[PDB]
C-alpha cells in the first residue's frame with residue numbers, strides 16, 4: 222500500500238553529477254577565490270582557517286598521496302579529536318578516490334585495533350596526542366606503512382607532518398588551481414568507512430553526493446546565505462559530525478569547532494561568533510535544560526539548534542528551545558548505515574517530539590512487529606528505510622549486512638516509530 226510508504230519530496234536542487242570529491246573540490250575552489258572566507262575556527266585556540274588555505278592544502282595532500290602511490294585500492298585512517306586539520310586528509314583522499322576510515326580518538330588500543338583491522342589502512346593520519354596509540358596498533362597491523370602527524374607544522378618525533386609529507390612528494394611547479402580531482406564510478410568507489418564490537422560501514426561516494434543535496438536544501442538543510450556560521454561540538458569521526466561538516470563546506474559556511482564541551486565557552490562562542498546554527502547531542506540538551514546562564518548571553522543571531530544520534534524527549538526539547546528563544550528544535554534521525562539523517566525536521570514545519578520527515582530520495586515505512594506488514598498512520602512498528610544513502614555493506618561481513626538489509630533494499634533500523642497525518646515521524650522505542 223503506497224499510501225503507507227512515506228516518500229521524501231523532490232530535492233529543491235537536482236542531484237549533481239560527479240564524485241563527492243569533485244563536488245567538494247568545485248565548491249571549495251569557488252570559496253577559495255574569495256579571500257578571508259572562513260572554513261573552520263577553533264574556539265579553544267581562536268585560530269581561523271580560510272577556504273583558500275583549506276582548498277590549497279587539501280589539493281596538495283591529494284596530489285602528494287597520489288605521488289606517494291595511493292589509489293582506489295588503498296585506505297587511510299584519520300584519527301583525531303575535532304581540529305582545524307581534521308578535514309584536510311579527508312578532502313584530499315576524497316579528491317583521489319582513496320577511502321577514508323575515521324577512527325574514534327577515544328577508542329583504546331583494542332577498539333582501535335578492531336577498527337583498523339577492519340579498515341586495513343596503508344597510511345594513518347593522526348594528531349600528536351594519538352601517536353602512541355597508533356604506534357602500538359601498528360605493531361600488530363603491518364599494512365600501516367606510514368604515519369603522518371596532523372597538527373604539527375614541522376616533523377614531530379621523527380614522523381612527517383602533513384606539510385613536510387606534501388613537500389616531499391609534490392612535483393616541481395605544482396599548481397593547486399590547475400589540479401583536477403579524479404573521476405570514478407561513485408556507486409562502486411568507497412568514500413568513507415565509518416564505524417558502527419563495531420563493524421566497518423562502507424559508504425560509496427554516491428551517498429555523500431545525496432547528502433550534499435540535502436545539506437543545501439532550503440527545507441531539509443540550510444539555505445546558502447553569506448556569512449553563515451555553525452557551532453559544532455559533535456565528533457567529526459562519527460556520521461553526525463562527518464556529514465553535517467562536509468555539507469557545511471559544500472555550503473561555504475564557517476564551521477566553528479569545539480573538541481571539549483564547556484558551558485561558558487559554548488555560550489560565549491554562540492554570542493561572539495554570531496552563530497546561526499548549533500549542533501548538539503541529546504545529553505547536551507539535558508545539560509542546557511539545566512543551565513541558567515543562557516540568558517546572560519546575546520543569542521539574537523541564533524536561528525536553530527540541531528540534535529540527533531539518540532532519543533530526545535519532547536519536553537526537554539521544548540525547554541531548550543524556550544531557553545534559547547527558538548520556536549523549536551531541528552531534529553535528525555539517522556544511523557551510521559544510512560550515512561546521515563534520513564528523517565529531518567523540515568524548515569518552518571517543526572513539531573515538538575518529532576524527528577521530522579523523510580528526506581528527498583528516501584522512503585520510510587513502519588512494519589508490524591508481528592505480521593511484518595506495513596502499517597498505516599499513527600501505528601507503531603519497526604522503522605525501515607530505503608534510499609541511496611544506505612551503505613553498500615559492512616566491510617567483509619555480508620551476514621551482518623543481510624541481517625540488516627533485506628532483498629528489496631529495506632534497512633531494518635531496529636527502532637520503533639510511527640508517522641502522523643502530516644507525515645512527521647516519532648521515534649518511540651527500540652527493540
Ligand SMILES: Nc1ncnc2c1ncn2[C@@H]1O[C@H](COP(=O)(O)OC(=O)c2cccc(-c3noc(-c4ccccc4F)n3)c2)[C@@H](O)[C@H]1O
Nearest residue numbers: 460461527528529530531532553554555556557561562648
Ligand atoms: N533523532 C533520534 N531520535 C531517537 N533515536 C535516534 C535518533 N538518531 C539516532 N538515534 C538512535 O541511534 C541509532 C543510530 O546510531 P549511530 O551512532 O549509528 O548513528 C547516529 O546516531 C547518526 C548517524 C548519522 C547521522 C546522524 C544525525 N543525527 O542528526 C543529524 C542531523 C540533524 C540535523 C541536520 C542534519 C543532520 F544530519 N544527523 C546520527 C539509531 O538506530 C537510533 O536508535
